[model samples]
Target: TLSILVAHDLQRVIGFENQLPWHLPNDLKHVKKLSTGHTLVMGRKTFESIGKPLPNRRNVVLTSDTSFNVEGVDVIHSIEDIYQLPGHVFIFGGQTLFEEMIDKVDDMYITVIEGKFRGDTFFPPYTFEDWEVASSVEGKLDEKNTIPHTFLHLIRK
Candidate 1:
């Protein structure tokens, strides 16, 4: 099983034109705090958005592109193959990746950005009432990340 790693806003927008809708450096720090040394799964576009494999992490690009090859990143065509990987799996999604795994993953680590913005991509619809909050931390208002946000750890109730 895997845990989901994501940042979504009031309207559930996670990405816009292949990038994040907001610039929250504190959220980025929160991401690194939670995900370093973890195995990550995502779409090729999501991988390209980061420009390279993240350091100290295992990058697994989920795509059907048999010819899409990159150094230091593993490629898998079927979303189901993700389950066979070991250790602290986190779905670093584009819209489609989350659609497939949202229900199957063990828990979620969500960065709840406080505002809304229209975007090309979104997190799949979810009802948080079905989940129990394990822990939460609010990001500070800072120079780089001015928005109010919370980093949440959730498990199925």
Candidate 2:
């Protein structure tokens, strides 16, 4: 079960200065729920942004630099390291990996943030023409969030 989870603003912005630009608690919870017991495969920068391995999930960091090492993570030099891995695996991002694996994913959990934002990194461009919505839930703007959003579960067609 390979999947992807991402949140992008209306402009398709995903990050600013290596960190997520917006804080949406519901989206956070949605990620936790989907990835809690699964393996989370992320790029090196994404791992560095969080500063620590996520609890209760296997953290695998992808980097071409062979010398890269982190105490709580499994370091791999290529995406092929987990190609035949068993069980659930999620491609958590920082642009590069998602762009590489987008077509290979079985499902996508996307959070569409309502407003435009200034960000240095954007989620790689993709289209819904080949994906079908499996489920969708709308979210409202509240004190903890800057914009309204929709959580979408999409499956490849």
Candidate 3:
């Protein structure tokens, strides 16, 4: 109902996909469940990563390029139309989209991985001012998979 629950992952280095000695963040469960029945805002690439539109929820894919199209999901061309969805929105990101909505979000559930990564995608840095750390869990990120990481949650300052 409000602008909250934004999520993203980034690398500390350019061209760092194979080098990030860590696994993907732990916030996917939040993303998956929220997006199950509500709407999910994501970039075209992020949409592609999921392979297909999710069931139950209307997937809103943001892209400037007009060539993309998919069944079961709506493609949005701009952030101005994001709020027009029926209700309950979660914005998943690719740097650009996250930056656009970060200022307007009420809460962010972030999983700040313990290790630095090599990546082409990145997120902007911020100090929580109006936002507060709502929750956090510290443990080895995920060693059985690939990387070492941890999780934390933040509310808009």
Maximum-lDDT candidate: 1
Point out where model 1 deviates above 4 Å: none
- Candidate 1 weakest ten by summed lDDT: 26-35
Please list the residue runs of candidate 2 whose C-alpha ends up more than 4 Å from where it truly belongs after superposition. none
Encode model 1's per-residue lDDT on 1-157: one tens digit a residue. 5899999999899999999988888887777877888899999889999999988889999988899889999999998799899999999998989989888988999999999887988898888798899999887896877889988899988
- lDDT pick, better of 1 and 3: 1
Tens-place lDDT digits, model 2, residues 62-129:
99888888788988887788686678999999788888899899999999998898999888877789
Please write out the lDDT profile of model 3 over residues 85-107, one tens digit for every residue: 77778776656666688777767
lDDT of each: 0.89, 0.88, 0.63
